[PDB]
Structure formats: structure tokens, C-alpha cells
């Protein structure tokens, strides 16, 4: 009846989004009053996003389509600094709209695989008309899209199909060997999140293998560690929507030079599924439970988490 769940996976893989989804699906979710509280973080996320892109234009030596935008860009830092946390002025709105629309800013945005741009950037910046209004109320999806900093381990608890779930997301905060051992102790299932769309990210300077291969190295280690014999290993191949949009223009050979298949969603996604499941060295004993997911899609998470729950039940 008591079920301990550990979310693992790279930063930006979708862990805290899943946590939020469990709140929406299996807890009370977000009321309109709570949603109003996320307004400031929506604005900051939006501004961080366009700033991140402006910075990359500098590093990447991409010029603005129209040179007037440079003053907008200069102004953005002043106006964002003038603050009023939770409120966007007509002038800030204007500055951001004209930046997001600039052909150079767009050129840089399309080159996001060369730098680190969060996946909520397009979502907010494409919704500027709705968002910038002084009467704007964040929808549940807006809230789901928010990016907050956190203090260490996160835990939500909920009851589903008569089970007490404790879902732990350790997150990007560095933890000592002892904290991990405590986390691993008494674990029913591990959900390993993978950002599919990370396949085309440029190698960092100190990095020997690409993000996907590091994710694979970690998963090999978790999945084959004898301590997890009776632990249900669940693999979420996440950001499938973003993967489907990318696979057309960025070949999977960026990530897997040996890939000989086509660049259809179907063949390239299957290929990644095999790369992961083939790391299982105890194939006859151990079964990976793999789902392709869009963590920001509430329906999909609900469906997938339903199948996962049936798996944990049956494993008795």
C-alpha cells in the first residue's frame, strides 16, 4: 500500500513538471487564486528567455534584423530592472514584442541547440498578446510552464487506486553519498526522465560525450545495479513533441553518428528506445517499462501514469 517513487534524470528532463502534473491529476491542482500568484514568475521567465537569446546573439555574433532593436535590447535591461514584480508596462511589452519579432532574434532562437535556452521560452513569448495585458490571469498551463528555483528534495504525496504514493524529485541540487543512499532506501519504482529533444545539443567545452550519452550512462548504471532487483524501472522518453518538430531539420546523426535510418519521428524515436533498453544486461529477469511522453501534456501524463500504476500493482 505504501509506494516510494524516485524521479531521476538530467536537469531540464521534465522531473518537476511531472511533479506538478501529479498535483493537477491526483491532488487539488491550482485554483484561480493560486494561479494569480504565479504572475510574477511568468513575467520573469519571459524576460529571462528573451535575455538569454540576446546574450547568445552577442556570443554568436548574430546581428539584429533592424538596428533599432539594439536600443530596444538596451532598454529591456532598464525596464526589467525598473521592476514592479508582477506587472508589465506598455513600454516593456512593446520592447519584448519587437525583439521577439526581430529577424535576427529569430535567427538566434532557431540556433538554440548552440546555447542553453529553456523550453518554456517559445511558449510564453508566442503568447505575449494574452500575457502582457494588465488583466492577465495565468491559466493552469501557464502555471505548469513556470520555472522556479527550489531548496533541495521535493516531495508530493497523493493517494491513487488505494495506494499511498511518495514521489521524490532530488533535482539539480548536489547531494552527498548519504542523502542518495537514504533516497534509494525503500524505493518501489524509479522513473527515469530523458529529454528526447536533447539529441542535437552542442557538446559543452569540458564534455567528452553528449547529453544523451550521459543520460544513457546513468541509466545503464541505475538499471543494472543489483540493489534495484525488485525496483520497477520506468523510462520516460520525454519531450516527444519537441523531438518530432526537430527531427525534420536536425539529423539524429548529430547524437548517434552510426544511425542509418530515416529522419522520420517513428524510426528515430524507436532507435533511441533501443539504445536505452539495450543497456539492460539482465534482459531475462528485468523489464524496462518505457513510455513516450510530453510532460507538459496533462492528458498524456494521466494516461501514462495510469499504466505505470497498474504495473506497480501487478508487481506484488
Amino acid at each position: 500500500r505504501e509506494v516510494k517513487l524516485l524521479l531521476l534524470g538530467a536537469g531540464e528532463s521534465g522531473k518537476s513538471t511531472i511533479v506538478k502534473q501529479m498535483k493537477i491529476i491526483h491532488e487539488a491542482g491550482y485554483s484561480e487564486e493560486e494561479c494569480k500568484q504565479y504572475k510574477a514568475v511568468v513575467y520573469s521567465n519571459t524576460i529571462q528567455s528573451i535575455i538569454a537569446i540576446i546574450r547568445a546573439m552577442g556570443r554568436l555574433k548574430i546581428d539584429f534584423g533592424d538596428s533599432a532593436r539594439a536600443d530596444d535590447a538596451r532598454q529591456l535591461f532598464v525596464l526589467a530592472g525598473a521592476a514592479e514584480e508582477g506587472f508589465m508596462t506598455a513600454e516593456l511589452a512593446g520592447v519584448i514584442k519587437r525583439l521577439w519579432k526581430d529577424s535576427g532574434v529569430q535567427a538566434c532562437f532557431n540556433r538554440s541547440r548552440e546555447y542553453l535556452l529553456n523550453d518554456s521560452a517559445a511558449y510564453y513569448l508566442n503568447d505575449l498578446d494574452r500575457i502582457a495585458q494588465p488583466n492577465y490571469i495565468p491559466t493552469q498551463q501557464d502555471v505548469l510552464r513556470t520555472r522556479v528555483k527550489t531548496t533541495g528534495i521535493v516531495e508530493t504525496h497523493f493517494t491513487f487506486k488505494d495506494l499511498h504514493f511518495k514521489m521524490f524529485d532530488v533535482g539539480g541540487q548536489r547531494s552527498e553519498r548519504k542523502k542518495w543512499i537514504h533516497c534509494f532506501e525503500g524505493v518501489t519504482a524509479i522513473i527515469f526522465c530523458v529529454a528526447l529533444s536533447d539529441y542535437d545539443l552542442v557538446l559543452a567545452e569540458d564534455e567528452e560525450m553528449n547529453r544523451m550519452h550521459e543520460s544513457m550512462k546513468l541509466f545503464d548504471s541505475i538499471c543494472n545495479n543489483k540493489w534495484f532487483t525488485d525496483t520497477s524501472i520506468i523510462l520516460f522518453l520525454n519531450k516527444k513533441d519537441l523531438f518530432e518538430e526537430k527531427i525534420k531539420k536536425s539529423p539524429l546523426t548529430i547524437c548517434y553518428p552510426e544511425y542509418a535510418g530515416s529522419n522520420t519521428y517513428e524510426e528515430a524515436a524507436a532507435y533511441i528506445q533501443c539504445q536505452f533498453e539495450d543497456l539492460n544486461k539482465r534482459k531475462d529477469t528485468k523489464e524496462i517499462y518505457t513510455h513516450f511522453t510530453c510532460a507538459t501534456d496533462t492528458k498524456n501524463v494521466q494516461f501514462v501514469f495510469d499504466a505505470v500504476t497498474d504495473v506497480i500493482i501487478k508487481n506484488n
Binding site: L8, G9, A10, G11, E12, A40, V41, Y43, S44, N45, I47, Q48, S49, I51, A52, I54, R55, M57, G58, A70, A73, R74, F77, A80, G81, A83, E85, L116, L117, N118, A121, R147, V148, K149, V170, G171, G172, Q173, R174, S175, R177, W180, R211, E214, S215, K217, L218, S221, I222, N225
Partner: protein, 35 residues
């Protein structure tokens, strides 16, 4: 294994900071190319 902890700490830390939470003073330092 200690090998697993190395991987975990490395792999789970990665990605996009400076793009989380409320606006902070450091996030708003003008880019050099705009000076």
C-alpha cells in the same frame, strides 16, 4: 556504488540556470556587445 553518485550529481545538475525563478540583479547585467 560511488560511481552512481558521481554520475547522478553531474547528470542531474546540468541545463539552464539564470532562467529560473524571479528576476535577480545578476540576470540584468548588460551584455558587452550592447555597450
Amino acid at each position: 556504488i560511488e560511481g552512481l553518485v558521481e554520475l547522478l550529481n553531474r547528470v542531474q545538475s546540468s541545463g539552464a540556470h539564470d532562467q529560473r525563478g524571479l528576476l535577480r540583479k545578476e540576470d540584468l547585467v548588460l551584455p558587452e556587445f550592447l555597450q
